[PDB]
């Protein structure tokens, strides 16, 4: 715990495009890595205001902050100081697709996150492009080792302003930059909340709690 302290800050930069609309976001976060809690404030720096739902971006802003039982190795914490990378595909139920690539490193005592995101094929009348979503329900991520990396699968659900839910099938691969002890399969319960936003979602605060279990 000379590397990952009980309190850690992070900085994040995202470049993205959704249905061809380019944007950039810069953010600052902090949290308690061993307790599985964190917050962040994100600001749209280019392309604002965004003409689509913030909710598709919120899960791209930190798996060093997952509470783990003592008998499950914390693969992503152990990847530091070098860090780890992750890539993700989210297949939404109406054909929209989000692809993400991310690098996580440790610089001068803070985590540094760099993200690229592409969203495509969202229907112009759908809840993403019409901003009719209302946050994520609690998620269960199934973690499993495969092919030398740590993988996760989620059946993720967005609440709809008009009622019901909008589903995404999510697959992620997380890989330490140096060889690290891979854990056996386990589950992570995640809850991400938007705790504040201005009217056009150009400044947004998030909170996330994440805990692994057998």
């Amino acid at each position, epitope marked *: 715990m000379a590397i990952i302290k009980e309190f850690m800050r992070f900085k994040v930069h995202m470049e993205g495009s959704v249905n061809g609309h380019e944007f950039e976001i810069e953010g600052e976060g902090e949290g308690r890595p061993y307790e599985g809690t964190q917050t962040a404030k994100l600001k749209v720096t280019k392309g604002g205001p965004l003409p689509f739902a913030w909710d598709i971006l919120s899960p791209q802003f930190s798996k060093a902050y997952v509470k783990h039982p003592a008998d499950i190795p914390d693969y992503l914490k152990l990847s530091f100081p070098e860090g780890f*990378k*992750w*890539e*993700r*595909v989210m297949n939404f139920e109406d054909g929209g697709v989000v*692809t993400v*690539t991310q*690098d996580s490193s440790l610089q001068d005592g803070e985590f540094i996150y*760099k993200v*690229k995101l*592409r969203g495509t094929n969202f229907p112009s009348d759908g809840p993403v492009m019409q901003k009719k979503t209302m946050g994520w329900e609690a998620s269960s991520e199934r973690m499993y080792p495969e*092919d*030398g*990396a740590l993988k996760g699968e989620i059946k993720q659900r967005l609440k709809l302003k008009d009622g019901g839910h909008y589903d995404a099938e999510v*697959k*992620t*691969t997380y*890989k330490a930059k140096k060889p690290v002890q891979l854990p056996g399969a386990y589950n992570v319960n995640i809850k991400l909340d938007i705790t504040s936003h201005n009217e056009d979602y150009t400044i947004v605060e998030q909170y996330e709690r994440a805990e692994g279990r057998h």
Partner: nanobody
Amino acid sequence: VQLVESGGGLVQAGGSLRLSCATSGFTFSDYAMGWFRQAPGKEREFVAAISWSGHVTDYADSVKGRFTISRDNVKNTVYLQMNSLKPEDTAVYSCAAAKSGTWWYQRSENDFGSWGQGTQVTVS
């Protein structure tokens, strides 16, 4: 660093074949990989590329839906499955490893390196 392609050949239109690229000398999962093709007299052109995890793929419009790029991060191999082949697909197909390792939908010859010598595909 070292890439060697195989799996080409001569097939009828409507056929299906699969190219593979063996690799050596680098950490395979540190690199995006790409397939390019070169027909007589034309410029070497982008076919498909795949990120380190396999989750992010990109295809030339001419082959989308007919070809699939994939990779095996244990065997350290890249594949190009080629279905619904047309005479216009005839070319030498070569594989390359990306510039840096963080790659993002980059299709230029110049963003890739460490080219293999390629494998001939001829469709009649």
